[PDB]
Design a protein that fits this description.
The complex is a heterodimer.
Chain A (H helix, E strand, L loop, with lengths): L2 E4 L16 E5 H13 L3 H12 L6 E2 L3 H17 L5 H12 L4 E3 L15 E3 L1
Parallel strand pairs in A: 1-2, 1-4, 2-3, 4-5
Helix pairs in contact in A: 1-2, 3-4
Chain B lengths: L3 E2 H8 L8 H9 L4
Classes of the chains: A alpha/beta, B mainly alpha.
Bound molecules: sodium ion (NA) (4 copies).
One sodium ion binds next to α2 of chain A.
């Protein structure tokens, strides 16, 4: 696709570069998660690495959780409750933000799988 | 803050990936499911 929304897992340690859209943004959830990473780091070396990861989003669009994302989160949440399937709540916020903007979620990990086929949801595994 | 090109992003990210252990820390801190 033309654009996509990176989740937190793409920032963590190669990616399938061919599948990354031409233009990328992330969300405030990932900003939060990378920041908690810096604050939780046990040793300077890890702290320095994680601090570089946090800094890598400094110029990048960080999409907020706004009203449209909130409405989407509710729809996706009930979809999951009915099916008896689960997603990390912070991953659901990410998916809600992306879906509400009709953008795919770009992920390195396996959490968004439960949402495949939900309206406005497109997951790209890298 | 702007939409990064694929090459731009991959330039900012390469050499700046978090340690694999961040997955562990995030499971503890933000691993709560629906
Ligand atoms: Na995100
Ligand atoms: Na720390
Ligand atoms: Na930052
Ligand atoms: Na989507």
């Amino acid at each position: 696709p033309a654009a996509g929304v990176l989740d937190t897992s793409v920032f963590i340690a190669q990616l399938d570069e061919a599948l990354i859209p031409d233009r990328v943004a992330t969300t405030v959830v990932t900003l939060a998660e990378l920041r908690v990473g810096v604050l939780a780091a046990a040793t300077t070396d890890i702290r320095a690495q994680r601090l570089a990861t946090l800094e890598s989003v400094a110029d990048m669009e960080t999409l907020p959780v706004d009203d449209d994302a909130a409405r989407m989160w509710a729809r996706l949440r009930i979809h999951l409750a009915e099916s008896g399937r689960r997603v990390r709540i912070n991953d659901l916020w990410i998916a809600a933000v992306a879906a509400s903007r009709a953008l795919p979620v770009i992920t390195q990990d396996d959490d968004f799988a439960a949402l495949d086929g939900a309206a406005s949801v497109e997951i790209i595994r890298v | 803050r702007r939409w990064l090109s694929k090459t731009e992003f991959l330039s900012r990210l390469r050499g700046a990936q978090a340690d694999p252990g961040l997955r562990n820390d995030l499971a503890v801190l933000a691993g709560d499911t629906t």
